[PDB]
Design a protein around this ligand. Structure first.
Ligand SMILES: [K+]
Ligand SMILES: [K+]
Ligand SMILES: [K+]
Ligand SMILES: [K+]
Ligand SMILES: [K+]
Ligand SMILES: [K+]
Ligand SMILES: [K+]
Ligand SMILES: [K+]
Ligand SMILES: [K+]
Ligand SMILES: [Mg+2]
Ligand SMILES: [Mg+2]
Ligand SMILES: [Mg+2]
Ligand SMILES: [Mg+2]
Ligand SMILES: [Mg+2]
Ligand SMILES: [Mg+2]
Ligand SMILES: [Mg+2]
Ligand SMILES: [Mg+2]
Ligand SMILES: [Mg+2]
Ligand SMILES: [Mg+2]
Ligand SMILES: [Mg+2]
Ligand SMILES: [Mg+2]
Ligand SMILES: [Mg+2]
Ligand SMILES: [Mg+2]
Ligand SMILES: [Mg+2]
Ligand SMILES: [Mg+2]
Ligand SMILES: [Mg+2]
Ligand SMILES: [Mg+2]
Ligand SMILES: [Mg+2]
Ligand SMILES: [Mg+2]
Ligand SMILES: [Mg+2]
Ligand SMILES: [Mg+2]
Ligand SMILES: [Mg+2]
Ligand SMILES: [Mg+2]
Ligand SMILES: [Mg+2]
Ligand SMILES: [Mg+2]
Ligand SMILES: [Mg+2]
Ligand SMILES: [Mg+2]
Ligand SMILES: [Mg+2]
Ligand SMILES: [Mg+2]
Ligand SMILES: [Mg+2]
Ligand SMILES: [Mg+2]
Ligand SMILES: [Mg+2]
Ligand SMILES: [Mg+2]
Ligand SMILES: [Mg+2]
Ligand SMILES: [Mg+2]
Ligand SMILES: [Mg+2]
Ligand code: NA
Ligand code: NA
Ligand code: NA
Lengths: 48, 272
RNA sequence: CACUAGGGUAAACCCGGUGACUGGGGCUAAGUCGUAACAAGGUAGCCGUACCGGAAGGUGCGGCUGGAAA
RNA sequence: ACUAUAGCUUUACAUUGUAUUGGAUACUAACUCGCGGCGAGGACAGUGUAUGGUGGGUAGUUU
RNA sequence: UGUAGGUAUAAGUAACGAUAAAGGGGGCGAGAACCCCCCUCGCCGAAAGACCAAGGUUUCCUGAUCAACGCUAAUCGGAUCAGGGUUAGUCGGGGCCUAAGGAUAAGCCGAAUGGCGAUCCGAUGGAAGAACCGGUUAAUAUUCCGGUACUGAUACUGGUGACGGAGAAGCGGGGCUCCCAAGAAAACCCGCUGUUACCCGUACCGUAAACCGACACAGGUGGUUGGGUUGAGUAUACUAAGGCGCUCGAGAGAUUCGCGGUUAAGGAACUAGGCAAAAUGGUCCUGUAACUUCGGGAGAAAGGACGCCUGUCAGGCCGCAGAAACCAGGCCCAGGCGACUGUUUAACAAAAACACAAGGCUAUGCAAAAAAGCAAUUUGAGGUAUAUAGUCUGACACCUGCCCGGUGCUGGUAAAAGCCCCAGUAAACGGCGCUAAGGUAGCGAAAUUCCUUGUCGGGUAAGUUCCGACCUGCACGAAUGGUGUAACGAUCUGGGCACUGUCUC
RNA sequence: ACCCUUGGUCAGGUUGAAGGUUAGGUAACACUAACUGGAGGACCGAAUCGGUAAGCGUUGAAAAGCUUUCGAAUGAACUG
């Protein structure tokens, strides 16, 4: 059967990418919280 | 005219469509058309503000000259054409100046005729005149509300209005709805009634034709749950109480025109 | 091996019968309810058509005199 | 059911002026709308404050 | 039913993941059912063969290794380690253009954060400036090489673009026609002899053991191609090319289960119910009823022929059987509901529920009513009363009675609304027993009837179900529509024929 | 789930609407017969989409499947 995750790199970057996060005040809030926690993977842009 | 379909299928048993007997051309004028995008009833925030809209055949918009400001320039009627955007047909005009325009096709206007706009124009079918220049008792359509703003009033297929009398700066006009009201005598109107009066005799026959025309199914309120509609709920069928909308607005005889609207000073008799 | 009377099969037709139940009609008496027509029969009568009434009937529209009174 | 409330509606004050004959009529200059200054309205309308109605549309609860 | 770690019990038990299948001979090795080579056998073959895209990311090739991983072992591997491997002026992309949408300018709105708002961004579309043939690697090739070519740079304001659907057609030897539901934008493009050729991708998997499903998982995954015989066919059966035998085996052949085959005589006696199975099935030629909205019903039903050889449909030949296997409608009579094709409870309900074409009522004269939003603004609609919106009814036919009393709806205080009163409105909600009116037509033991298996008739040997009637309708009834209705239904329900392991058993 | 923009897909067979032409017919239209035509939320049926009925599975191969059967299959279709 069809499962919930149907991968698309363009959609992944458009939805959760670094520039998508920086475009909004709440996205920058997410980035600041992740930096404060010390995540090695800031966004899905860091992954490969 | 109309064409009644023979009952070869159940979806065609009750189908009546137009005969398309007035159309003289099949291709629109390229410089006067543009592709039109659809809304699903969604506004600029993306939320569906109007229901039962969606899909349908792709359409192109035709530029209709509702203003007719080329006063004194004669024009020749070239073609009568189908317009997907309105119930009436449209007419292509060639001005002696070399311009082109589309107008609402009045009843009785034939390919090869001449039309004109402005005060000096003869009051013939298809001509656009200020109401001060139209003889009293003439059947008219495409009536301006403010001078220079373009025709707004009588535009649907088969509809017409009548100039009953004039009273100085205002004339008195009887509307398709039966309202009698005063219109500034500097506003423009076109002589004749809108064509395609057999448009009201057409029957879709099946649900697919409504889908082609771009309508989506409409659900009754009594077959919903109370959380969705005030008229929903109950075990088995129930009447739903007093008819009202999702926001509780009564649907039988409650008036919604603003009681202090200024235009009511120009409305002599009312009828809806 | 054809030909065929006769046999079986199916259908469909025609001719008859019977059937829970359900409708007119004729005749005889006269129980019941009214008085529609015959006199201008007490709202002149009748013809066609439509609607309606426990029933004769009533009313609308057009027609006729096979109607008085005038 | 109790109590509120969005919305709708009424009136007063502000925005808000002039003249005639007060209670209406008229005016244009506030204000509103249309066409590209001109036209159409007009002290109304809309908006703010206050106020009386209405209000399972929404909410908090009781039973 | 406390938490972490460790170890037990069930137990050497369930299970080792599609019943497409394996046998032998050699090789290598300490070790072989499984690795390598050969022969034979079997499976797919509109695929289980060959390609493009998404997605993955070195899984590709070679040498070492067999600890762990591989549902067994392994000398093998998509495993571990190391080395190697992807070559473009012409292929794909990007560079150029715009769609939905997004970000913005001038401006608008707004406690803040901000929300809007026409140029720019943005392909899934439009342009691209431009080839093939052959050979070659362990692993790349239109990229490397040999020919053959071509393309781009460089030094001597009206037209096009630019657009739909459907159908015909060009042993022996493209346009055309028809139709209504009327079929993007912008760039662009028209008219008015050398010397060079940049950047990114290129391996490998890709109906899958490499993607999405925790797995080397019987599922899901867009596009192209897809030989021969048979056929109407891309169905079906067999089979080339190519690819596979599905990563546990060997014996044995109890009970029992799963998937299949046959069955005397009977033939629905089974069961809630013919559930399941059986039966029907092709082409051509005859022949087709009630009813009907005149289209249908209809492939109704019911019959006949069919192979091979010879001769211009007849004569002959063979078999139990000539539609030959595979493939391939069961039919009829009569009811309820819903006109019909559709939609729905992803994962126990597909229906009589929803929708529907169509009817009515009500609102709305245009900054329309109405819907979102604090607002700006947007939808409605760039439509204009033959239009838009709210609401009920639900094709069609014949129709749709009485009530305005009740409840809704419409009219005529702070510093006038209302309320009253009167009038109206039932295809408004609602009612149809002292009253506002006391149920018209049509139906009726009904998807409604408690009593109740009501009573009578039919059907059966026997009928609480079914069909036709009756009417004291517990408690039908006219747009929360009444009564019918051809056609339609993986609907509910009754009776027949065919047929049968459903049953006697 | 619904919508918006831009693309793609639907073997094969059957039926035979409008319209047209030709004969008759009429004052003229109508109207009859043949040929043609190829419409349709039309029919049968692969791909495909869905999920009727039964069997199986129920520490499953699968946190919803498989086999047979069955609905739709030019459209209110399916799909990137
Ligand atoms: K509806
Ligand atoms: K409610
Ligand atoms: K006469
Ligand atoms: K316990
Ligand atoms: K390759
Ligand atoms: K037997
Ligand atoms: K029995
Ligand atoms: K019954
Ligand atoms: K698919
Ligand atoms: Mg419900
Ligand atoms: Mg009830
Ligand atoms: Mg008498
Ligand atoms: Mg008398
Ligand atoms: Mg009477
Ligand atoms: Mg509450
Ligand atoms: Mg609390
Ligand atoms: Mg426990
Ligand atoms: Mg045990
Ligand atoms: Mg297991
Ligand atoms: Mg076992
Ligand atoms: Mg393959
Ligand atoms: Mg390898
Ligand atoms: Mg090795
Ligand atoms: Mg092992
Ligand atoms: Mg390796
Ligand atoms: Mg651009
Ligand atoms: Mg290769
Ligand atoms: Mg798999
Ligand atoms: Mg193909
Ligand atoms: Mg083939
Ligand atoms: Mg096949
Ligand atoms: Mg037997
Ligand atoms: Mg029994
Ligand atoms: Mg069965
Ligand atoms: Mg149905
Ligand atoms: Mg259906
Ligand atoms: Mg379910
Ligand atoms: Mg189900
Ligand atoms: Mg209904
Ligand atoms: Mg109904
Ligand atoms: Mg029974
Ligand atoms: Mg009965
Ligand atoms: Mg009713
Ligand atoms: Mg169909
Ligand atoms: Mg299929
Ligand atoms: Mg089919
Ligand atoms: Na590929
Ligand atoms: Na890739
Ligand atoms: Na059977």
């Amino acid at each position: 059967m069809k499962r919930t995750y149907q991968p698309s790199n363009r959609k992944r970057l458009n939805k959760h990418g670094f520039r998508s996060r920086m475009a909004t005040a709440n996205g920058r809030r997410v980035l600041a919280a992740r930096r404060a926690k010390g995540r090695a993977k800031l966004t899905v842009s860091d992954e490969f | 005219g109309i064409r009644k379909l023979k009952p070869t299928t159940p979806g065609q048993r009750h189908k009546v469509i137009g005969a398309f007997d007035k159309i003289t051309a099949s291709t629109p004028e390229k410089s006067l058309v543009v592709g039109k995008k659809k809304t699903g009833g969604r506004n600029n925030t993306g939320k569906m503000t109007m229901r039962y809209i969606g899909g349908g055949h792709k359409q192109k918009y035709r530029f209709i000259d509702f203003k007719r400001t080329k006063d004194g320039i004669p024009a020749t009627v070239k073609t009568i054409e189908y317009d997907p955007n309105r119930s009436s047909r449209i007419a292509l005009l060639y001005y002696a100046d070399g311009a082109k325009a589309y107008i609402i096709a009045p009843d009785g206007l034939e390919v090869g005729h001449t039309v004109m706009s402005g005060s000096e124009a003869a009051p013939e079918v298809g001509n656009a005149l200020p109401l001060a220049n139209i003889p009293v008792g003439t059947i008219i359509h495409n009536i301006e509300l403010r001078p220079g703003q373009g025709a707004k009033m009588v535009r649907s297929a088969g509809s017409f209005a009548q100039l009953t009398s004039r009273e100085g700066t205002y004339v008195v006009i009887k509307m398709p709805s039966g309202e009698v009201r005063r219109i500034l005598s500097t506003c423009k109107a076109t002589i004749g009634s809108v064509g395609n009066s057999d448009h009201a005799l057409e029957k879709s026959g099946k649900a697919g034709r409504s889908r082609w025309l771009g309508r989506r199914p409409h659900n009754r309120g009594v077959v919903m749950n109370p959380v969705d509609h005030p008229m929903g709920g109950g075990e088995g069928r129930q009447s739903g109480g007093h008819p009202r909308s999702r926001k509780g607005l009564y649907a039988k005889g409650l008036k919604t025109r603003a009681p202090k609207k200024h235009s009511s000073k120009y409305i002599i008799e009312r009828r809806k």
